[PDB]
Chain A
Amino acid sequence: RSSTPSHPRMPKPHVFHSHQLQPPQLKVLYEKERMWTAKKTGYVPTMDDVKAAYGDISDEEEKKQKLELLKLSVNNSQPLTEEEEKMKADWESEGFTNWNKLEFRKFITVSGKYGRNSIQAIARELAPGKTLEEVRAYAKAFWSNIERIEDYEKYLKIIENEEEKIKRVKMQQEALRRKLSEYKNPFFDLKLKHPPSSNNKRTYSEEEDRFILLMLFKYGLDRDDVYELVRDEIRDCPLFELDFYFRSRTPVELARRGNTLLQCLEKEFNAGIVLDDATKDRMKKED
C-alpha cells in the first residue's frame, strides 16, 4: 500500500539540452520508465498532460491523443527487462557524466583557437575541468559524433573560423620568408609593388613599411607580443631618432599597418605557397 495523492507524473527524461553526448538509445529507456512509473502510481493521463506533444490549440487530433497516450502508459508491457536494466547500466557509463556546460563553452572556443587537434593546448586550459586524459576522452568522442549535437552547425562554423584565422596567419609567416629570402639587401631593395596600396593616405614611408616587415621577420608571426616588440625595435634603432611619426605609432596602430602589409604579401604567394603545398609526397600517394 502507498498513499501518494498527486496530480501529474514525470513525463520527461533528463535535460538533454546539456547532452554530455551519450547513447541516444538511452532515451528509449527513460520513456519505458516514465510510462511504467506512471501506471505503477496510477496518475491518469490527460489532454492537460499533453505538453511535450502540445503545439495544438484545441484541434481534433486531441480526440485520440489523450486516449492514445493513455493506452501506452496503462499498456506498459515492459517494466524493464533484467537485461534492459543491464543495457541501462552500461550506457549510462559510456556517457560523460562529468562534462557540463561551462566545461563545453570554454572548450569549444579554445578547441578552435589553440589549434583544432592541438589537444594539450586546449586541455591544459581546462585544468579544473578534468585531466589531460579526461579531456582527450571527450575528444575523439566529440568528432566521432559531431554530426549529432544540438546546433552542431553553429558550433562548428565558429571553430573552423578561428582555424581559418590561424592558418591565414601561419601562411603569411611563410609568404614573408619567401619574399625576404629573395632580396640580398632587403632593407633597401625589398619591396612588394603588386598589392601595396591604392588611394589611401600612406602615412608610413615606403621605407618604414620595409622596416616593420624586417622586424616581423625578426620575431616571426606569433599572435603574441610581436607588434609590441617591433615598436621597441623602432624605439631602439637610432636611424629613426627623428622620424617622430614612426615612434608616434602605438603597438596598436603600428600593428594595424602590419595586418595590412601582411595581407598585401599574402595576395602574392597564395598562388605559389598553396600550389607548392599541394605537391606533398606520402607513402603510396605520389604528387
Chain B
Amino acid sequence: AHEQVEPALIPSNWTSVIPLLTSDFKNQYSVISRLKNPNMKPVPYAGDIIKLMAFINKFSSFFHSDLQNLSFQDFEVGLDLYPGDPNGSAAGIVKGPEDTSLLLYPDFMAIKDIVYCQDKMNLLFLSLLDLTFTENFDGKSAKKKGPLTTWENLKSSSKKVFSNPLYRLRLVAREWGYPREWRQQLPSDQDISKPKTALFEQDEQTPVVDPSHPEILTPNIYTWNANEPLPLESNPLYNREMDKNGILALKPMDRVVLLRALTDWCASHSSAIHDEIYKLTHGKKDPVFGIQTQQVPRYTIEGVDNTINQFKKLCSLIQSRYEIRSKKKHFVKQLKEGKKPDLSRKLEILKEIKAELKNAVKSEKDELLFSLYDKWVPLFEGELPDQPLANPFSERLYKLRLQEFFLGRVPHIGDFYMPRLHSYGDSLEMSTFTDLRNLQALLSKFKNNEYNAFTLFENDGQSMSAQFKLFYHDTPSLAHDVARGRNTSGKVYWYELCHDSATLLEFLEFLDYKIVKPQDEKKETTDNNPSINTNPLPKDAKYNTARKKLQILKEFLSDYYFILRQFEQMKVQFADMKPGKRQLRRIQRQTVNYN
C-alpha cells in the first residue's frame, strides 16, 4: 500500500459482548434425549416462570423491593407447583433415593415460609394489575420514587382489594385476547381458522350490473370462528373467589396461566412499560452487529478463554491500526496544534505502556491484561464503539433482546438457561450480571473462600434471590416444530437439571460423562446403571463441536457453584434483615466466635 493501509477493523466482528442466536444454529435437528438422569425433571411450567422473572428483571424499576428477590423456587412453593410430570404440575415430590411415596410442601419445609412464598406471589398479582390498568401514574405522579403497588395495599381489610382492579380487566377481556389455555376448543372437530364455516350468500353472482367492468371483487362474504374464551360458567377469568381473595383462588396451574397472560397483557397496554419498551427499542442508535430475535453475551457462547483471547487478538490489532496512523505524514504535522482531544494524547498513552511491554520478564505477559486494562480503555474511542471486554447490562440497546439467563448453547443438544433474579439498576453489588472481567474475579473470590455469605449479605446481598434452578431447553426441537408447521399445543421443551448446591455437582459430575471423548477408537461409569441415566456421547466429528461447548458449561457452572452455594446459605442464616451501624458490628462480630 501507499503508507501501509491500516489493518481492517470490523466492529461487528468484535461484538460488544453481544453476539446473537438467530435460532438457526439449529438447522440440524437433535431432540435426542441421551442426557437422562435422576436430576432431570421435565417441568412444563418451567418456561412460563422464566418469563415472569425475566419480565420483572427487565423492569426492575416497576416493582417493589421484595418483588425483586424472587427465585424460580419462590414461585414453586408459592403456587403448589411441583416439577416432574410433563402434563403440567404433579402433586408430590419423591424424597430420597428409594421412595415411591412422595411429599408435599407442608410435609417438607416450614409453614411460616410457605405463607411468605404465597404472600409474595399475590403481591406480584395486584402489582401487575395496578401496573396494567392503573396507569394513571405515568411514573412521575403520586408515587415518584416508589413503585406504585406496595405491601400495605395487599394488607388492607377492604373487602374488594382485588375486585376493583379485576373488574377493570374482564371489561377488556375479549378485546385483549385470551390465553391459549382459556379458549373453548372449537365445539366442532372439523373447523379450523384458515377456513371459515358460515357460507353467507348461498350462491355467487354472474351477470353483474356493469358489463364493461366485470370486476366482481366480492364474490361472497364469509364469517370467521375466531378464538373465543370459555363460558362465564367455566372461564377462570371470572372466578368469583379471586375478587376478595387474592390469586390463590385458581387451580395451582391455572394460577400460572393467568400470571403469564398477565405479563404479556401488561407490556401491550400499560401506559407505562409498553410506552417504555418503545424508548428502549426506538433508541437513537442500533447495535453494530444488527437487530435480532435474541441477543446474548460473548463469553456465554465463546467460553471464558476465547472471550479474552479474542480480546488479546484485538487489543493488539488496535495497537497497529493506531501506530500506522500515528506514523502518518498528515497526522504528525497536525499534532503541533492538537488535532483532537483524545486522538492526540491517546497516542502518548500507548508508548508509555508499550515500554512496559518489553519491560519486565517474559513470563509476566499474563500481567498486561490484569494490569493495563484500565489504562487501555481510552484507546477504544477513535476506533470501535464497543468491544468484547465490556458489561452488557448497562447499555440501552443490549437489553430488551438480551436474555439475562442464557448460560450458553451446545450443538445437537440445545440451550441452557439459569433463572436467576435481580440484574438491573440499584443494589447491583453482588450481581453475577457484569463485565466478564468483574464476574471472573467476583466468582473467583468465592471459590477461594475470600468472600463469605456474610460479605455477600453486607452489600445488598438479599437483592439477589438465593434459591435457583438449572434448565435444559430443547430449542432444537421447538424449532423444527414451528419451522415445519407451528404444531405445538401441549408439548414440553423445558427440563430441570438441579435445584441447589450438591445437586449442581450431581449434574456437573454427570456432565463429564458426555465431554469424555471416547478414546476407545483404539480397541481390539458404573455397570447396569445406564438404566436410569445413559452416559457416553456419540464419538464422531459432529459431536466434537458439542463437547468443546459442554466443557465451558462445566467450567462456568463449576465456578458459579461457590457463589450460588453461599446464596442458599445466606437465606438460611439471614433472611430479610438490615445490617445497620449499631447492629452491623455485632453481626459480623459473632463470626469471631463461630470460627
Residues of A within 8 A of B (CB): 114-121, 124, 136, 139-140, 142-143, 163, 166-167, 170, 185, 187-188, 201-208, 218-220, 222, 224-225, 228-229, 231-233, 235-245, 247-251
Is residue B286 within 8 Å, beta carbon to beta carbon, of the partner chain? yes
Residue pair B47, A119 in contact (C-beta under 8 Å)? no
Is residue B219 within 8 Å, beta carbon to beta carbon, of the partner chain? yes
Distance (Å) between the CB of B10 and the closest chain A CB? 20
Interface pairs (10), CB distance under 8 Å: A115-B215, A116-B215, A120-B220, A143-B209, A166-B217, A201-B282, A207-B23, A232-B180, A237-B488, A241-B51
Q: Using CB atoms, name the residue of chain B closest to A235.
A: B264
Most B-side CB within 10 Å, residue of A116, A118, A206, A218: A118
Q: Which residues of B contact A201 (CB under 8 A)?
A: 281-282, 286
Q: Using CB atoms, name the residue of chain A closest to B20.
A: A205
The CA-CA distance from A201 to B281 in the complex, in Å, is 8
The CA-CA distance from A203 to B283 in the complex, in Å, is 10
Q: Using CB atoms, name the residue of chain B closest to A242.
A: B403
Q: Which residues of B contact A243 (CB under 8 A)?
A: 293-294, 401
Given contacts A225-B224, A239-B482, 13 further A-B contacts (CB under 8 A): A114-B221, A115-B215, A115-B217, A117-B217, A120-B205, A163-B215, A188-B27, A205-B293, A232-B227, A235-B179, A236-B486, A238-B478, A244-B54
Residue pair A235, B180 in contact (C-beta under 8 Å)? yes
Q: Which residues of A contact B327 (CB under 8 A)?
A: none
Residue pair B177, A224 in contact (C-beta under 8 Å)? no
Residue pair A232, B47 in contact (C-beta under 8 Å)? no
Cβ-neighbour of B268 out of A185, A242, A250 (below 8 A): A250
Distance (Å) between the CB of B446 and the closest chain A CB? 28
Q: Which residues of B contact A142 (CB under 8 A)?
A: 209
Residue pair B268, A238 in contact (C-beta under 8 Å)? no
Residue pair B50, A242 in contact (C-beta under 8 Å)? yes
The CA-CA distance from A117 to B210 in the complex, in Å, is 6
Q: Which residues of A contact B478 (CB under 8 A)?
A: 238-239
Distance (Å) between the CB of B242 and the closest chain A CB? 22
- A207-B23, A237-B488, A248-B277 known; A163 and B268 CB under 8 Å? no
Residue pair A228, B210 in contact (C-beta under 8 Å)? no
- A201-B281, A219-B193, A244-B58 known; A118 and B268 CB under 8 Å? no
Residue pair A119, B482 in contact (C-beta under 8 Å)? no
| Residues of B contacting A: mostly | loop
Distance (Å) between the CB of A165 and the closest chain B CB? 11
The CA-CA distance from A126 to B471 in the complex, in Å, is 61
The CA-CA distance from A136 to B205 in the complex, in Å, is 12
Is residue B216 within 8 Å, beta carbon to beta carbon, of the partner chain? yes
Q: Which residues of A contact B277 (CB under 8 A)?
A: 244-245, 248
Residue pair A115, B216 in contact (C-beta under 8 Å)? yes
Distance (Å) between the CB of B361 and the closest chain A CB? 49
- Count how many chain B residues have C-beta atoms less than 8 Å from C-beta atoms of the other chain: 58
Residue pair B221, A242 in contact (C-beta under 8 Å)? no
Is residue B31 within 8 Å, beta carbon to beta carbon, of the partner chain? no
Is residue B493 within 8 Å, beta carbon to beta carbon, of the partner chain? yes
Which chain B residues in 35-63 approach chain A with CB under 8 Å? 47-48, 50-51, 54-55, 58
The CA-CA distance from A119 to B58 in the complex, in Å, is 54
Residue pair B224, A236 in contact (C-beta under 8 Å)? no
The CA-CA distance from A157 to B209 in the complex, in Å, is 18
Which chain B residues in 242-287 approach chain A with CB under 8 Å? 261, 264, 267-269, 274, 277, 281-282, 286
Cβ-Cβ contact count across A and B, 8 Å cutoff: 148
Q: Using CB atoms, name the residue of chain B closest to A246.
A: B293
Cβ-neighbour of B282 out of A117, A120, A203 (below 8 A): A203
Q: Which residues of A contact B293 (CB under 8 A)?
A: 205, 207-208, 240, 243
Distance (Å) between the CB of B215 and the closest chain A CB? 5
Q: Which residues of A contact B267 (CB under 8 A)?
A: 244, 247-248
Distance (Å) between the CB of B571 and the closest chain A CB? 27
Mask for B458-484, Cβ within 8 A of A = 1, else 0? Answer: 000000000000000000001100111
A-B pairs with the 4 shortest C-beta distances? A115-B217, A117-B208, A115-B218, A118-B218
Residue pair A118, B400 in contact (C-beta under 8 Å)? no
The CA-CA distance from A121 to B269 in the complex, in Å, is 35
The CA-CA distance from A249 to B48 in the complex, in Å, is 19
Residue pair B268, A202 in contact (C-beta under 8 Å)? no
Mask for B195-219, Cβ within 8 A of A = 1, else 0? Answer: 0000001000100111001111111
The CA-CA distance from A235 to B486 in the complex, in Å, is 12
Q: Which residues of B contact A231 (CB under 8 A)?
A: 177
Residue pair B209, A136 in contact (C-beta under 8 Å)? yes
Q: Which residues of B contact A206 (CB under 8 A)?
A: 291-292
Is residue B24 within 8 Å, beta carbon to beta carbon, of the partner chain? yes
Q: Which residues of A contact B208 (CB under 8 A)?
A: 117, 119
Residue pair A228, B194 in contact (C-beta under 8 Å)? no
Is residue B226 within 8 Å, beta carbon to beta carbon, of the partner chain? yes
Is residue B235 within 8 Å, beta carbon to beta carbon, of the partner chain? no
Residue pair B180, A118 in contact (C-beta under 8 Å)? no
Residue pair B479, A242 in contact (C-beta under 8 Å)? no
Cβ-neighbour of B217 out of A116, A203, A236 (below 8 A): A116
The CA-CA distance from A247 to B268 in the complex, in Å, is 7
Is residue B22 within 8 Å, beta carbon to beta carbon, of the partner chain? yes
